[PDB]
C-alpha cells in the first residue's frame, strides 16, 4: 500500500512517502516543480539501475537535471569527495535555489545532506534512500557528515530533508545481506522502543523477508515514527534518550573495528550486539532469559547472527567499548546504563562464543 | 569598556571592547576553567598574539592547544580547514571543545565553520584583530571558505558565544588595512544612521589616531547597526539585509578587474559608495551636498573616491549584473536616499550607472 509519514522535528517539517513504483508518480519529487533544477549525487551501483529513470520523470516535469556519480564505498564519504560535488554544482552553475537529490544508501545520504548544508550555506536537499537502512535510519534526525580518518562522521551538520522518496521497488536489487543488515535496525526500534511492533515484527518477518509491499510499506513507517518521537524528544540529547538508538552498537562497533570493512556489515555487527547487551542485561540481573531468547529467534528468521566471530576473542572486545550500555529493560523498553563493570560485559561476550 | 548583546536566530551573544581586554577577568566568556579551547591564528598573528591570549586562557584554568595556519585569503579553503580538523582530532578534542578566532575576517570564517562542522558544531568564540572583522564578521553569523569557482560557496550560518575585541590588537595593523574598515564604518552611516554618520565627521581623525574611546564608541556602534538590520530581515525575505551591500556592487567590479590585493576591498566599496550616491542624484533622491559630505569623509579617512584610471565604464558593467544570461543582465543597485536613509533598486538603466562610474573618473 502507499504509506506516508510527516516528521516536525526543529520546527521543519516534511514528508516521508513510502510505495511500490513511487518513482513513476506525479510530483513524487515534490518539492521539485518546473522551472527548477536538481543534481542528483548516486554512486557507480545505483547509477546504472535508477538514475535515468529518475532523471526522466523529472525533466518531463521540467526539472533541469545534472548529475555526478560517485564510487561505491564507505571511503567515499570524505571531505575530498564532498569538494567534488561543489565543483560539479558550480561547473554546471548551480545557484542557491538548486536541489541536491540524494540516489542511494546512507553513505550517499549522508555525503550529500552535508553538501546541502553546506554548499552557499544550504540548499534543498530530497533523500531517496535506496537501502532498508537508510530508509529506517537515514531518513530521520537530521544527522549528515563525512569522515575524518581519525574519526567517523567527525565533519558534518544538523540538516533535514525537503522531503524522502522510498519506492520499494528499489529494494529488489538490494543484496538480501544487505536487506537483513537493515532487518537488525528495523527490530532494533522493536526492543527499544516498542514491544508490540516487535511482537508485529514476529507475526510479519516471513513477509518482510520476501518483500512483501504491505508489510514492508508498513515496517518502514513504524520505524521512521518511532525515531521521529525519540528524536524529537531530545533534540539536543538533553536525556539519553536518543541515545536508547545505539542498543548492540557498542558491541557492534567492536566487531566492525577488528573485522574490518565490509567483512561484517553494520546490521551483522548491530544483531549479535544486540543479544550480548541482552545476556548483560540478564547478568546484572534485569532481563530473563525467555525475553532474550525471543530477540535471538528473531534475529536468526532475518537470516542474521547470533554470535560472535570465532575470530575474535572477549578481550578484543574491550579496548574498543567504567563501560557505557544500552540495555534493554523488557521487549519495548530500555535504558543508558553507565558504569556497567568490565567482567560483566566479558561475561556476556562469553556467552555468544561460536 | 563597551558592550553590545547580539541576539540573532534565537541565539545571543556578548560583543565586548576595550583597550587591554585580553587581560581582564573573565574576558573569554563563557570558557571557564577546566574546559578546552583551541586557538586558530594565522602565521602573521601567531608571534604578536597567540602567546599572550594562551597564557590568560591557562591562568584562568582552561586547557589549551593552537593550531597556525598560513595569511590570506587564498588559503581560505576547504582543504586547509581539514587541518584545524585534524589538530582537533589529534588532541582529542570532544564536543564540549571551543574554537578561538583569533585573526582577520579570513581566520574568523574559516574558524567559524570548523567550529559549525565538527562534531556537527562546538562553541565558537571571535577574537576579530581587524577592524572590518570587528565591525562586519562579529554580527550576521555568516561562515565560510572559498572554492576556486566561487568566493564564500561553501559555509553554514553559525553564530558565536562571544566576541572578544582589544583594542591594542589595532596597533599592529597597518594603516591601509585600518582605512579599508573604515570604509565599513562609514557605510553604516549612510546606509542606517545619520547621526552616527555626523559622529563619523567629527571623531575621523581621532579614529585615525586610534584614539580608545572613539574607537570603542565605534565599533559598539556599528555593531549595534548591522544587528539590528539583519535582526529584521531575517523572517522576511526581500532583503533589508541586502542594504549592507551599498558600494559593493560597484566595488565587485573595481576589485574583479584590478586583480587581488591591488585595491583592498574597504577601498573598493568606497570609490563603490561615492558612485552609489551619484547614482542616487541622477535619478532625482540625493542631493550633491549629501554626496560631498560622503566624498569629504572618505578622504578623511585615506579612501579612494575616484575609481582607477585603469577602468572605464564598460569594463565595470559585465562585473555589475546578476549574471550575463539571456534573462539576466539586470543591476541592481544599493542606493542612499538621505545620510542615513537606503533603498534597493531594481532593474536600473545602463545609461545611468555609466553616468554616474563617469561622474567618478580620475
Ligand atoms: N542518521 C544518519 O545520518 C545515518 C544513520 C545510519 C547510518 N548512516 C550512515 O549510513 C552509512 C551506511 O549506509 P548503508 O547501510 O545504506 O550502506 P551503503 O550506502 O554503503 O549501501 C550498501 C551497499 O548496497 C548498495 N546499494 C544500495 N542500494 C542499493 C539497491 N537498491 N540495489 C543494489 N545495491 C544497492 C550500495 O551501493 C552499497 O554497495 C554509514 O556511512 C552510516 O554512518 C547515517
Ligand atoms: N559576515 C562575515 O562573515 C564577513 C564579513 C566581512 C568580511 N568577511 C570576510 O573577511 C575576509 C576579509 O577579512 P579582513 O579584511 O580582516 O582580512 P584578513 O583576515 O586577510 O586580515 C588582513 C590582513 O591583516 C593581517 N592582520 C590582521 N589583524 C592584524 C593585526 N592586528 N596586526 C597585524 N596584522 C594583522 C592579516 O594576517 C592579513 O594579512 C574576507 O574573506 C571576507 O569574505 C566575512
Ligand atoms: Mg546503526
Ligand atoms: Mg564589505
Avoid at 9 to 25: F, G, M, T, V
Avoid at 131 to 153: E, F, I, M, R, W
Avoid at 285 to 292: D, I, L, N, R, V
Wanted: net charge negative; aromatic share 6%.
Amino acid at each position: 500500500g502507499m504509506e506516508k509519514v510527516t516528521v516536525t522535528l526543529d520546527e521543519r517539517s516534511y514528508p516521508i512517502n513510502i510505495a511500490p513504483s513511487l518513482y513513476q508518480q506525479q510530483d513524487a519529487f515534490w518539492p521539485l516543480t518546473a522551472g527548477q533544477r536538481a543534481m542528483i549525487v548516486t554512486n557507480e551501483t545505483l547509477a546504472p539501475l535508477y538514475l535515468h529513470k529518475i532523471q526522466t520523470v523529472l525533466e518531463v516535469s521540467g526539472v533541469k537535471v545534472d548529475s555526478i556519480i560517485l564510487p561505491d564505498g564507505e571511503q567515499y564519504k570524505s571531505l575530498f569527495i564532498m569538494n567534488d560535488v561543489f565543483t560539479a554544482l558550480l561547473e554546471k552553475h548551480h545557484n542557491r535555489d538548486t536541489t541536491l537529490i540524494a540516489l542511494g544508501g546512507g553513505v550517499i545520504g549522508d555525503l550529500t545532506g552535508f553538501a546541502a548544508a553546506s554548499y552557499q550555506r544550504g540548499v534543498r536537499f530530497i533523500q531517496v534512500p535506496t537501502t532498508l537502512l537508510s530508509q529506517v535510519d537515514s531518513s530521520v534526525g537530521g544527522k549528515t557528515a563525512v569522515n575524518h580518518p581519525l574519526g567517523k562522521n567527525m565533519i558534518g551538520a544538523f540538516y533535514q530533508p525537503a522531503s524522502v522518496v522510498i519506492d520499494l521497488d528499489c529494494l529488489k536489487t538490494l543484496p538480501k545481506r544487505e536487506l537483513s543488515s537493515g532487518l537488525a535496525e528495523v527490530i532494533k526500534y522493536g526492543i527499544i522502543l516498542d514491544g508490540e511492533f516487535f511482537s508485529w515484527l514476529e507475526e510479519n518477518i516471513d513477509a518482510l523477508m520476501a518483500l512483501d509491499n504491505q508489510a514492508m510499506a508498513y515496517c518502514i513507517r513504524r520505524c521512521c515514527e518511532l525515531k521521529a518521537q525519540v528524536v524529537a524528544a531530545d533534540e539536543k540529547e538533553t536525556s539519553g534518550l536518543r541515545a536508547l538508538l545505539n542498543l548492540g552498537h557498542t558491541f557492534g562497533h567492536a566487531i566492525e573495528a577488528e573485522m574490518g570493512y565490509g567483512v561484517w556489515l553494520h546490521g551483522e555487527a548491530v544483531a549479535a550486539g544486540m543479544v550480548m547487551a541482552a545476556k548483560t542485561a540478564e547478568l546484572i540481573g534485569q532481563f530473563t532469559p525467555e525475553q532474550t531468547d525471543r530477540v535471538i529467534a528473531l534475529l536468526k528468521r532475518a537470516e542474521l547472527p547470533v554470535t560472535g566471530p570465532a575470530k575474535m576473542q572477549p578481550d578484543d572486545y574491550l579496548p574498543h567499548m567504567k563501560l557505557h550500555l544500552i540495555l534493554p529493560t523488557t521487549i519495548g523498553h530500555s535504558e543508558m546504563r553507565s558504569d556497567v563493570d568490565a567482567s560483566t560485559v566479558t561475561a556476556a561476550i562469553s556467552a555468544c562464543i561460536p
